[PDB]
Design an enzyme around this catalytic site. Structure first.
Site, mmCIF file in Angstrom:
data_model
loop_
_atom_site.group_PDB
_atom_site.id
_atom_site.type_symbol
_atom_site.label_atom_id
_atom_site.label_comp_id
_atom_site.label_asym_id
_atom_site.label_seq_id
_atom_site.Cartn_x
_atom_site.Cartn_y
_atom_site.Cartn_z
ATOM 1 N N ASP A 1 0.854 -1.208 0.000
ATOM 2 C CA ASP A 1 0.000 0.000 0.000
ATOM 3 C C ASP A 1 0.880 1.245 0.000
ATOM 4 O OD1 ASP A 1 -1.908 1.927 0.241
ATOM 5 O OD2 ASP A 1 -2.464 1.403 2.361
ATOM 6 N N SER B 1 -0.378 15.778 -12.039
ATOM 7 C CA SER B 1 -0.596 15.419 -13.449
ATOM 8 C C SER B 1 -0.812 16.676 -14.292
ATOM 9 C CB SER B 1 -1.783 14.445 -13.578
ATOM 10 O OG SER B 1 -2.150 14.206 -14.906
#
EC number: 3.4.23.22
Length: 330
Positions: A35, A199
């Protein structure tokens, strides 16, 4: 040193991925959920409330000649999906894919929430976010990657998740045979303890690319792609009959649909998520309503590049003094 381990989807939808991890002496092999959105290595154990164990493999510290109680230490964690676990702590020898760390904090569950009990395939979590999020009190503990880092050939790990197929986690090296083209590196903020990056924008199907900054986290422990409501509405508007359902808890679409791809930017580079990656199947057995793999982040407080996004790429988690992320097509 290096390590290399295969990661396998837990079911036919890629709801999560499990990776075998050796704990203790002699080895006890548990299948953990790696994770990058949390920082605790915790396991089902001989200490877990008996009624909360339903088919998991358990760690028994009393059978390990290298286990030591970390006196006084406790832990307690709550995840973004509402699940939780807590317990006490041992140090022990932990190996992943041939890479060994001595004195790793192994957090032994006394209690787990119902979603953990109900998932027989996940024996615990191995956190790979920054050690500043580790929940051990009163002495915070280091992640497996942080303990291994100085011994590695290069201070990196890589995630290469499969679509409906196994993949790989590598520690300490970049397999130049595992991706196409070049790796594009992008800046990371560690201020929230996550692999947080920005992004450069998105496209829906064959549509034009929209240049826009989307701050979010690279999180292998989250199944779906969670993005701002504007971006998610633009995607689902391209699918006839798609709608946001308050009763189901997100966007649903007709199972008869063919889904468009979704592209996200990494600097001047582009990662394309094929449409089939965005199909999470019937909302209930036999339903013709299917659950979408792109959902709104509006009720979370952060954008999450989860498995739907990451499985489209070869992803480098660069733990150099200034951390960075790398993305390649594959």
């Amino acid at each position: 040193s290096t390590g290399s381990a295969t990661t396998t989807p837990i079911d036919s939808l890629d709801d999560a991925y499990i990776t075998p991890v050796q704990i203790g002496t002699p080895a006890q092999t548990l299948n953990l959920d790696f994770d990058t959105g949390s920082s605790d290595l915790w396991v089902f154990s001989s200490e877990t409330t008996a009624s909360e164990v339903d088919g998991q493999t358990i760690y028994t510290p009393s059978k390990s000649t290298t286990a030591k109680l970390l006196s006084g230490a406790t832990w307690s964690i709550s995840y973004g999906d509402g699940s939780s676990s807590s317990g006490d702590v041992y140090t022990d020898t932990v190996s992943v894919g041939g890479l060994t760390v001595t004195g790793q904090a192994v957090e032994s569950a006394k209690k787990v929430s119902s979603s953990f009990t109900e998932d027989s395939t996940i024996d615990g979590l191995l956190g790979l976010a920054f050690s500043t999020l580790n929940t051990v009190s009163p002495t915070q503990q280091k992640t497996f990657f942080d303990n291994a880092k100085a011994s590695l050939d290069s201070p990196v790990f890589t995630a290469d998740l499969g679509y409906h197929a196994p993949g790989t986690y590598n520690f300490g090296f970049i397999d130049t045979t595992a991706y196409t083209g070049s790796i594009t590196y992008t800046a990371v903020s560690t201020k929230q303890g996550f692999w947080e990056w920005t992004s450069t924008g998105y496209a829906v199907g064959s549509g034009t690319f929209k240049s826009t900054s989307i701050d979010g986290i690279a999180d292998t422990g989250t199944t779906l792609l969670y993005l701002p409501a504007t971006v998610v509405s633009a995607y689902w508007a391209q699918v006839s009959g798609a709608k946001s359902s308050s009763s189901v808890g997100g966007y649903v679409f007709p199972c008869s649909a063919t889904l468009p791809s979704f592209t996200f930017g990494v600097g001047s580079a582009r990662i394309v998520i094929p449409g089939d990656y965005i199909d999470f199947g019937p909302i209930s057995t036999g339903s013709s309503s299917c659950f979408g793999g792109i959902q709104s982040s509006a009720g979370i407080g952060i954008n999450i590049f989860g498995d739907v996004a990451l499985k489209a790429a070869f992803v480098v988690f660069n733990g150099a003094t200034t951390p960075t992320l790398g993305f390649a097509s594959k």
